[PDB]
Amino acid sequence: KRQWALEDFEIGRPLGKGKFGNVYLAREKQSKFILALKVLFKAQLEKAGVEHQLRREVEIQSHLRHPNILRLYGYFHDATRVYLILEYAPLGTVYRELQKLSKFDEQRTATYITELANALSYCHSKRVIHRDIKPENLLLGSAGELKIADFGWSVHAPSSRRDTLCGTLDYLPPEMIEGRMHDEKVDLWSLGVLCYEFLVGKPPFEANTYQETYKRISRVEFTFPDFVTEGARDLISRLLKHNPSQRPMLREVLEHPWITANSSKP
Numbered sequence: 001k002r003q004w005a006l007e008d009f010e011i012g013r014p015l016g017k018g019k020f021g022n023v024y025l026a027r028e029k030q031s032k033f034i035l036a037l038k039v040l041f042k043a044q045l046e047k048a049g050v051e052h053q054l055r056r057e058v059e060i061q062s063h064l065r066h067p068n069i070l071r072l073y074g075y076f077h078d079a080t081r082v083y084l085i086l087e088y089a090p091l092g093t094v095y096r097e098l099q100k101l102s103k104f105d106e107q108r109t110a111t112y113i114t115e116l117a118n119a120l121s122y123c124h125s126k127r128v129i130h131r132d133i134k135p136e137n138l139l140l141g142s143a144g145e146l147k148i149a150d151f152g153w154s155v156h157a158p159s160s161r162r163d164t165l166c167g168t169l170d171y172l173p174p175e176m177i178e179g180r181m182h183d184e185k186v187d188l189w190s191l192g193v194l195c196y197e198f199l200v201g202k203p204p205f206e207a208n209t210y211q212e213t214y215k216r217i218s219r220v221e222f223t224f225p226d227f228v229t230e231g232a233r234d235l236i237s238r239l240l241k242h243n244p245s246q247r248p249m250l251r252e253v254l255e256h257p258w259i260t261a262n263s264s265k266p
């Protein structure tokens with residue numbers, strides 16, 4: 001097992017900056033392996049009281065091995081910083097791709113949903129705790145394959161999402177906002193919101209004010225535009241159920257006729 005140090009990397013341009021640190025594009029000096037280096041300030045972690053939580057998250061992520069979950073290759077520290085060595089996804093976020101294309105066709109959508117369901121099934125089997133998944137948590141690797149990232153609760157990605165304010169509420173399920181306990185079935189709700197947003201260009205409970213969005217989520221009040229197809233409507237409708245126990249298993253998603261017919265990944 002190798003013991004890394006900062007001197008082992010050629011640090012490149014920042015990918016992100018926030019209160020808690022900076023992320024850089026980088027390369028290993030010897031091998032020229034391209035990667036991303038997340039650098040967190042110990043002082044900020046301590047001030048926020050999340051040092052312990054972060055270490056736990058990094059340890060868990062370091063052991064995960066899934067094609068659709070961003071790899072954490074290693075980590076190290078010095079007197080003032082913690083350094084996480086992460087996989088570089090060269091094609092950016094699904095958030096940005098959605099901005100570029102406005103909406104996705106059924107093939108791209110079904111493929112992404114397959115990849116996410118696969119990653120989530122792996123997460124559930126390892127009981128990996130994660131925050132609700134949004135397009136900005138979805139990176140794209142060299143093959144245009146989804147990579148889940150920034151999913152730890154410890155520290156929030158300092159990312160200029162722009163849209164409205166926060167933009168997290170749109171992805172939260174009723175049981176969460178209503179203060180009930182929640183379990184892994186929140187992920188099925190997330191997949192439904194994401195499938196819809198991919199095909200439509202906006203999430204199903206979007207409104208001009210958060211007060212309206214809280215209502216619409218609580219009452220599962222949403223509509224399909226005319227162009228959304230029967231199979232897509234079926235999947236999304238099955239996923240966006242108020243009662244979490246009524247949502248399907250991830251295996252059912254991966255076997256859904258609309259998914260099998262359109263996904264480029266079988």
Ligand SMILES: O=C(Nc1ccc(Nc2nccc(Nc3cc(C4CCCC4)[nH]n3)n2)cc1)Nc1cccc(C(F)(F)F)c1
Pocket residue numbers: 015016017018019020021022023036037038039040070086087088089090091092093139149150155156157158159
């Ligand atoms: O910046 C972040 N995520 C992030 C950053 C940039 C992007 N944009 C982007 N655009 C093009 C390519 C690209 N590739 C990436 C980005 C990454 C990781 C670096 C950190 C998380 C994912 N690997 N590959 N990313 C997406 C997500 N995450 C993050 C989380 C906590 C704390 C900090 C900080 F303190 F260091 F600032 C940061």
Ligand SMILES: [Mg+2]
Pocket residue numbers: 163201202203
């Ligand atoms: Mg939007």
